[PDB]
Every structure is written in structure tokens, then in C-alpha cells.
Design a protein around this ligand. Structure first.
Ligand SMILES: C[C@@]1(C(=O)Nc2cncc3c2CCCC3)CNS(=O)(=O)c2ccc(Cl)cc21
Ligand SMILES: C[C@@]1(C(=O)Nc2cncc3c2CCCC3)CNS(=O)(=O)c2ccc(Cl)cc21
Ligand SMILES: [Cl-]
Lengths: 305, 305
């Protein structure tokens, strides 16, 4: 029993973290085989960020201008290239601790573990979700750039995020491991703001099913709803529209508990209208949206209480 | 910016997890040097749990009755002994991945990371606190016994908890690595319950300071209070008494924000007597008590390992 925001064991990623230095800037890199991946803004000064010409800044660099440190060993850079917003530094040593891995681009609503790093050294691990506005609510200080997001289903590490930026509201933006940013963000200091964020409806429903599996049913009601009527109510509370794909994905949780998806939608409608009345659901006084249906299945017992 | 429930990087502990089997029972073990540490109830059947005589059950077992598996390699047990509620299995192979470590007993209010394991394989990592009633609010299913709790200090892993039991309310109980239980619990199937719990006051204050560091100031006021008047209010809301030691420990957070500890106590007094009035603090509608003053300092500073 119990339900916690759980991250994947970070050991396989810890063995890939390195420090990348270019001039006076120092950040983190990800060392997989003989390549170190890091944000391309490592070659920028603060003044360069207003309007950087990365192609012009990069051509003035040689391999020996990049210092890569793995633990207390200096790696040697033997090539460099830029792919979108990431820099790929070819090194003379393949990482002997390289795990089985894949690069995957995720969709909003999907969760992942973040290994926060400073100076190539891991400091902590926490669970995050890609918000509908393509930002993440992380915990990052100066020096955390290059820290990565990942999932580890089986023994394979699926890298999905690399940290690049903090926005004015304290939320974070980054790229996939091919250097493509999530959202309309750019690696330039310009008027960039997080768009209006919304609640990940399919994840709230998944967490209500987790509460039922763990033994709580107080929030259920005798009503049902059509999918369109539920969406008309949901959008009034800044909740994301629920699609047929989301209803399909909730199928296994619906079968394990015996509660139809549109009947759980009716409980969600009532909870939005009434609040909790001094009660909690899985130790929370707010409706939780950073657990996917897959996360609930992974953590919860296969037997409902 | 940002504030997340952060766990320590789990890599150093992942390299110590093994599977221990005795008869039909299978659980987790911690392999450090040539010793595997696991709950002594591994030698019990369901019938033996009603009233076990561990010395009598153990004398009937030989070294070859214990199956220890580290990955896909079978370790050989060459000796066995019992220390309190922990079994120590001497193996023929020293763990080449043994980190720098210590066994430390923690006090209620202290936090630690848990690496949840099943069949000697790590599945997740999460943060939790030792409650004043000596239980932890963990997330564990059948097979999780032997999973460990820890903190990291530079290069050194301080093991503080080993999982043994789930109580009727869904909360958990266990021992330190010397086999001494936290709380008045016993390792047998009998009527045991979590006592009435209380809120960890020094941790709520630490989290209010974290909210001020991150830009949440609505709860501050012009008032102050004394230790005695604050404790008279706290006792009424099932909050732990605040001591001069707690005030001293909150010193660095008080200096960083410019808010005296008794000044912050006056803000908590008003939150206890009036509530949040539809507002949140660091994304929560409840007063969070599972972040110590040291956890707030570490997360708002970037301490690496
Ligand atoms: C490198 C930087 C950034 O966001 N750093 C950072 C990234 N994560 C967290 C924290 C920071 C800063 C301090 C608080 C914590 C610098 N600011 S910027 O507006 O010029 C900018 C603009 C675009 C990009 Cl891709 C990066 C940056
Ligand atoms: C081994 C067991 C235990 O709590 N297992 C367990 C531990 N963590 C989680 C979950 C369980 C069980 C199933 C639900 C989830 C079994 N119950 S018991 O009352 O006989 C008992 C009594 C004393 C001790 Cl030290 C252990 C146990
Ligand atoms: Cl996805």
C-alpha cells in the first residue's frame, strides 16, 4: 500500500554525467559511447544570449577550447558539431558505463525522472511531467543546464529531456536529445513566457483510479456523463480536453476497479464543483496530475483493496 | 527556482541490492563487502509468523538453505548469524561495488531516501520522513521487504532504514541496519497499530522559509510570538513542540531570508488558526512537514555527490 511520487533509480544516468567547460561557462554533459551531449549555449556569454549567432560563435572554436571532465579524469575532445540546440563533442574515450539507451521525444502529459546535476556531479532525483504548455515545473539552480530527464522501462534508459532554460515565472524549458526544444522556446534571451497552463485531465483520472485501488471511494457518485458534456465542464476549470485515446488508455484501470471511464469523469466533474470538504485523496488536498495511467499501473497493486 | 521532494541519487545503493530466498520466502538483501544484510523474518513461514522463536528456526537452517542472487550470479553463503531483527549472511564474494558507508540510527522528523526493490531489483526511489510515531508513509507492495533507506554525505552512504512491515493503516515499519526497530513494533503477526501521529513543526517552518526563498510571501505578517505562546497553540493542533534547539537549527534559513524564527512562528500560528483561504504555498493546500531545515538548505544551494 501507499502512493508516492516515485522516480526511476538514477544509477545508469549517474555514470554518464560529465562537466563541460567552454571559456568561463561551465555546465553538464551526457557521455554516451564516445559523444558528450550538452546545450549549445555553453559557447555563449551573457551578452551573446540577446541575439546569438551560434554558427559564427562555433566556427571560432577548436576542439581544445572545450574542457570535458569525467570524475577526476580529463577527456580529450577530437571533434565537435551542432545538431539543432545541442552540441555534440566527440571524445577519444568511449564511456565504459554506457547503459542500453534510446533517445525518445515525449508528448505533454508524459512523466519522467530528472537527475539534477552541478559541475558534472549528481545532486538529486525527482519526478516531473511535460506540462501542456511544454514547460516543466523542475527544481534547478544556476549550473544545472545539461541535466537530463529519462524513463527506464526494463534495463533500457530512454533519454527524453535536456535542461536549457528557466523562464520568468520559475518554470523550465529544454530540448529532446536531438536538440529540438519542447514548446515555442528558443535558446535566446528574448520576451519568452510560459503560455497559460492547464491540468492534465487523463492523469487526474489515473490518480483517482489509484485512490480507488488503494481503498478509497468517497468521491464516487451515481452519475455518468457524455464525453462532450465532460469536456464542456473541464475546459471551464482550465483542464485539458479528454480524447477517445485518453479513454482507451484508461481501459486497464477501468477494468481493475470496475468503474467505467465516463463514470470516473462524472466523479471528477463533482470534485471540481465541490472541492474536497476537509478530505484528502492519497494524502493530497489538491487534484494531482503528474501520474500517468502507465505510472499508476507500475506502482499500484494489481489487486484492488 | 522550483521546489520538489527530492531523493538522493540512488546509484551507490543500486550496486548493493541482491535477492535472498529461504524456502518459499523471497525478499531483498543489502550486500556490503562479504556480508548480505536482510530481515530475519526471511526464515519464517506464514504459520511461523504467529509466534516465531527465531533462535529455534535459525538453528535448523544450514548455509546452503539460503539462496543469494546478485544479478544473474549465484553467491555462496559460507556463514550466518543474527543481530537483533537482521540476518547477516557471510558470502564467499566481496561486493566490488561496495561504497563508502556507515550504519546510522535516525530520529523522528529526519528524512531519507528509499530505494524500493523487488526480487533484488531496484524499481524506484522516493523521499520520506521518520514520523513522530516511528512509522514511515512509504509505497511498498509484497516483496519489498529488505528495501533500504539512506542519506548521502559527499561520498559516504549512511544507511538508516531497512523495510520489514506494513501496518493495518497502510503505513510502514522497519529497523536500523543493526536490526533495532524504529517504534514499539515486533517482527511477528500480532495486533499492532500506528499510534496517533503529530506534525513535525520544525519541518513546516523550514518549508515556509523555502516558500519565502522562492517568492511566496503572502503569509508573512508584522507580528511576533514567544516560544511558550507558540507551543500553547501548536499543542492544540497536534503539532510537535518547538524547542530552542529547533530555533537554533533554523538560524541559517532565518539569516538568508531576514525573517526571525519567532516571526515565522507567528505566521504559522495564523495559518493554523485561520487556514490558507483558498491559497497555496509552493503548490500545496496543506502545511508540508517532510522537508528538514537541512533539506531546504541543500536544495536551495546545489550540494552534489
Ligand atoms: C542560461 C540561461 C538560463 O535560463 N539559465 C538557467 C537555467 N536553469 C535554471 C536557472 C537558470 C538561471 C538562474 C536561475 C536558475 C540564462 N538566462 S537567459 O534568460 O539568458 C537564458 C535564455 C535562454 C536559454 Cl536556453 C538559457 C538562458
Ligand atoms: C511480512 C509481513 C508484512 O508486513 N509484509 C509487507 C511489507 N510491506 C508491504 C506489504 C506487506 C504485506 C502485504 C501488503 C504490502 C506480512 N504481514 S504480517 O502482519 O504477517 C507481518 C508482521 C510482521 C512483520 Cl515484521 C512483517 C509482516
Ligand atoms: Cl509520450
Amino acid at each position: 500500500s501507499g502512493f508516492r511520487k516515485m522516480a526511476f533509480p538514477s544509477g545508469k544516468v549517474e555514470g554518464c554525467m560529465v562537466q563541460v567547460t567552454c571559456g568561463t561557462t561551465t555546465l553538464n554533459g551526457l557521455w554516451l559511447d564516445d559523444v558528450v551531449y550538452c546545450p549549445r549555449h555553453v559557447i555563449c556569454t551573457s551578452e551573446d544570449m540577446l541575439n546569438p549567432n551560434y554558427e559564427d560563435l562555433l566556427i571560432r572554436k577548436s576542439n581544445h577550447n572545450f574542457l570535458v571532465q569525467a570524475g577526476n579524469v580529463q577527456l580529450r575532445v577530437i571533434g565537435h558539431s551542432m545538431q539543432n540546440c545541442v552540441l555534440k563533442l566527440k571524445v577519444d574515450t568511449a564511456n565504459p558505463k554506457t547503459p542500453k539507451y534510446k533517445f525518445v521525444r515525449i508528448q505533454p502529459g508524459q512523466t519522467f525522472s530528472v537527475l539534477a546535476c552541478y559541475n558534472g556531479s549528481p545532486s538529486g532525483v525527482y519526478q516531473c511531467a511535460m506540462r501542456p504548455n511544454f514547460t516543466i515545473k523542475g527544481s534547478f539552480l544556476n549550473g544545472s543546464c545539461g541535466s537530463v530527464g529519462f524513463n527506464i522501462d526494463y534495463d533500457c534508459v530512454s533519454f527524453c529531456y535536456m535542461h536549457h532554460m528557466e523562464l520568468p515565472t520559475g518554470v523550465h524549458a529544454g530540448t529532446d536529445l536531438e536538440g529540438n526544444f519542447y514548446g515555442p522556446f528558443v535558446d535566446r534571451q528574448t520576451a519568452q513566457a510560459a503560455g497559460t497552463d492547464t491540468t492534465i485531465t487523463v492523469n487526474v483520472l489515473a490518480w483517482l483510479y489509484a485512490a480507488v485501488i488503494n481503498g478509497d471511494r468517497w468521491f464516487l457518485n451515481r452519475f455518468t456523463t457524455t464525453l462532450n458534456d465532460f469536456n464542456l465542464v473541464a475546459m471551464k476549470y482550465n483542464y485539458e480536453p479528454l480524447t477517445q485515446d485518453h479513454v482507451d488508455i484508461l481501459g486497464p484501470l477501468s477494468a481493475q476497479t470496475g468503474i467505467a471511464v465516463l463514470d470516473m469523469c462524472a466523479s471528477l466533474k463533482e470534485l471540481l464543483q465541490n472541492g474536497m470538504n476537509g478530505r484528502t485523496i492519497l494524502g493530497s488536498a489538491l487534484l494531482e496530475d503528474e501520474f500517468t495511467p502507465f505510472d499508476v499501473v507500475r506502482q499500484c497493486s494489481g489487486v484492488t483493496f
